[PDB]
RNA sequence: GAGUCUGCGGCGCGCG
């Protein structure tokens, strides 16, 4: 095409990894990245589905505010360490995911140490989990399960074991979303807009690839409105 | 408001949202419902409003009103003088037009 | 001639005409020197055409900035009805230019209290503060300068 | 009010009676004395300072008027009230920078 | 609490916690008790010129 | 379908006249009718194309700021409630189409007093242009276009006749869009979002015609994604 | 291969 059509939205990209991808679109009529750009975050960020630790059982611990011998870090610096860790299962049938591991002695805990289950897999290896010292005695079950936005431990309170204590979920595989509309000049009238969103992933998902799930889902509610009633 | 009952509709996610923070900075008396908590708010002169760009509400009441505004003559001060070469005085050699 | 179209009545601008900063609003010609011609303005037009108009182009432009339509025209021509034409002055001719001056950044606007200020921007109402029924503001006051 | 009258910016009815034509340029009123007198109206005039001084007619055809109401409104009035600039609905808040 | 810098402020946007709220945050080597808005105005800065130590 | 998918947006619709058109859409999952009701309320407001006077010609008038005998109003005073007139055409071989009307004497010029055009309606009947006294001689010929925003008279210049003038073009179709979110029960998670938006509209287009085109407009965009670089 | 000549001193008011 040629004239209106043909000057369309060139969508550039710029990715490094699969953590961070800039994604370029203009020329955009009056105030349309904004109208674009606002709605993909608010996706990016609730809609794109994931895993996150759930909940956590440590053998001897009770409580979340309790210390292990010969272990340095506390159970809430290392629940805290586990919401960092990211697992990718490969299909439905694995709703939740029950990871297990067991280490004693002077060795370091990484997510590498955690037994392979057969459909689940673990990008996050080198991820440290604890220091054990001497007569370190540390056995826990780590559930994992696939689900969306943010959920509280207070609000899905997770009871595998009567002593577990459940951990916050962090189901979005995108950290954060950032969309800038900078003017921008097409020969006859300077009023443009030009939107440029950026997006970071923890890895699991690639910004690109996130990107289309959200348009997509936007889209599958575009067409919501068919029946009246 | 009063239109709006009975129009067919209650309060936003964003309507209630706002109403949060609010109370948590002191606008409006904790524990009334957001129907009689907005009055209260609208009463102090401010009401909820959205973004426009956004359609997030803007976290905080704003308030807003009929505000009698006029236009200033615009002299010819105004219309802008940008000079590139002209005129010269006959006497002293200075730029005039 | 596409510069003498407006001027349709000859010399005057016609009225209900646009006029552009740089259109001529009326006419006029005097001459080219002091009291002598020129040498080499002489060798010029004896080149394309020795035949030139020796009167000078002096005529009432539009100054820029701007002008809008013609609406009223006065002229005082030779026999005087009841005016005073100064000495020197053959005729005088008056051009009544009016405009809409539309809102635009440039101008600025006041309330009675004191608070002026410029027009920065002007936004389309499409994403504007509005409020929850549809109705959106028209203009957003600094809070700041109060 | 006050100072559209004491000023002249709009025309007022002299005595009680009805109106008789309501030109754009000029409202012939018939007072109830038995008197009809022309208002020509200042079309559009060059003020001092370029502005434009207009009488619009307020009053319709054949109108019962009373003693100093407005027939045509000044400059810039409404309704015999001074008016300069308009109400505009407001947002008292901060935007980005503009 | 919050390991990383990030998760701090995706709760913020989803609601859970206000920028101007007292929350404990994971940083560089230490656990800091500090508002995400502190955080996040760090970031900023950090962003502003690179060399974010 | 039956669980998720049956589980759809429930599109309901009240519409009366061709102005006023209430639109609500649920259940919807977290935060999802400010993600849809936004972007849609800027797309309404800014993009939707419609119909305006474009230029006008009064027979003895030769400027915008003249005023004709026997008219109460002055030449500025009517172009500008001619742009208050809403006519409504029905297909695109209308592209402009110029409204003729002539009326004498002590009569009140109301919009109805427009020669009927074949396929162009006028919904702004009773819409006062002027009030006729005696020997008053009004003929014009208002012109009327369809295209999209705001268009300074000034910007397009249009020259019928030599001495009519331009008029200031709006072509917004809808005065006022309002949306709102609240919360909607579904059995099991309370937290959910349930968006009704309600929109206004001149008469030339309905709310549930403009509705279409903005959801049309934004799924447009969408696909602008597609080629990178 | 264009360039002359006019707009000064003061006064008043208004913006910043």
């Known amino acids: 095409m040629l004239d209106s059509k043909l000057k369309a939205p060139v969508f550039t990209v710029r990715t490094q990894g699969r953590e961070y991808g800039e994604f370029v679109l203009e020329p955009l009529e009056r105030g349309f990245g904004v109208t674009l750009g606002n709605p993909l975050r608010r996706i990016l960020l609730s809609s794109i589905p994931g895993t996150a630790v759930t909940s956590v059982y440590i053998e001897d611990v009770l409580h979340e505010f309790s210390t292990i011998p010969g272990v340095k ?21 694995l709703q939740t995911v029950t990871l297990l591991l067991k280490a004693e002695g002077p060795k370091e805990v990484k997510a590498r140490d955690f037994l392979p289950v057969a459909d689940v897999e673990i990008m996050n290896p080198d991820l440290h989990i604890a220091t054990l010292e001497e007569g370190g005695r540390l056995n826990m079950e780590v559930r994992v399960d696939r689900g969306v936005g943010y959920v509280p431990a207070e609000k899905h309170g997770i009871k595998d074991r009567i002593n577990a204590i459940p951990v916050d979920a962090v189901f979005s595989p995108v950290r954060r979303v950032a969309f800038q509309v900078e003017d921008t000049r097409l020969g006859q009238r300077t009023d443009l807009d030009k939107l440029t969103l950026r997006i970071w992933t923890d890895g699991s998902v690639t910004p690109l690839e996130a990107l289309n799930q959200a348009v997509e889902i936007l889209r599958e509610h575009l067409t919501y409105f068919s029946n009246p009633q | 408001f009063g239109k709006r009952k009975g129009e067919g509709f209650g309060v936003d996610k964003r309507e209630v949202e706002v109403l949060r923070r609010a109370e948590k900075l002191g606008l409006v008396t904790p524990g009334k419902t957001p129907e009689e908590q907005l009055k209260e708010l609208f009463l102090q002169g401010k009401v909820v409003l959205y973004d426009g760009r956004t359609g997030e509400p803007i976290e905080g009441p704003i308030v807003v009103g009929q505000m009698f505004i006029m236009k200033l003559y615009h002299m010819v001060e105004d219309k802008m003088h940008a000079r590139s070469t002209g005129p010269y005085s006959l006497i002293t050699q200075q730029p005039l037009g | 001639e596409a510069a003498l179209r407006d001027l349709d009545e000859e010399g005057v601008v016609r ?77 005088v001719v008056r051009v009544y230019v009016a405009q809409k001056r539309k809102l635009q950044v440039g101008d600025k606007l006041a309330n009675r209290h004191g608070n002026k200020g410029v027009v920065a921007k002007i936004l389309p109402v499409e994403d504007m503060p509005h409020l929850p029924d549809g109705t959106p503001v028209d203009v957003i006051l600094n809070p700041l300068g109060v | 009010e006050r100072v559209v009258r004491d000023s002249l910016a709009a025309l007022y009815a002299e005595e009680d009676g009805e109106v008789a034509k309501v030109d754009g340029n000029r409202i012939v009123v018939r007072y109830e004395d038995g008197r009809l007198v022309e208002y020509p109206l200042r079309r559009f005039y060059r003020s001092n300072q370029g502005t434009a001084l207009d009488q619009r007619p307020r009053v319709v055809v054949g109108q019962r008027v009373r003693k100093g109401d407005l027939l045509a409104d000044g400059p810039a009035s409404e309704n015999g009230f001074l008016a300069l600039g308009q109400n505009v609905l407001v947002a008292i808040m901060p935007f980005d920078g503009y | 609490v919050f390991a990383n810098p990030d ?43 690179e060399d974010e130590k």
């Open chain 3, 15 to 91: 009225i209900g005409a646009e006029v552009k900063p740089g259109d001529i609003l009326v006419g006029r010609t005097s001459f080219k020197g002091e009291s002598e011609p020129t040498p080499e303005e002489r060798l010029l037009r004896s080149i394309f055409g020795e035949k030139a108009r020796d009167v000078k182009d002096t005529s009432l432009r539009v100054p820029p900035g701007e002008g809008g339509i013609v609406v009223r025209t006065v002229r005082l021509r030779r026999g005087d009805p009841g005016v005073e034409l100064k000495p020197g002055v053959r005729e």
């Open chain 5, 7 to 49: 998760e701090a402020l995706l709760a913020v946007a989803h609601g859970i916690v206000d920028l101007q709220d007292v929350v404990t945050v994971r940083y560089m080597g230490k656990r800091l008790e500090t508002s995400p808005g502190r955080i996040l105005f760090a970031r900023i800065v950090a962003e502003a010129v």
């Open chain 1, 73 to 93: 870090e506390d159970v809430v610096e290392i629940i805290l360490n586990l919401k960092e860790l990211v697992v990718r299962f490969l299909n439905p049938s």
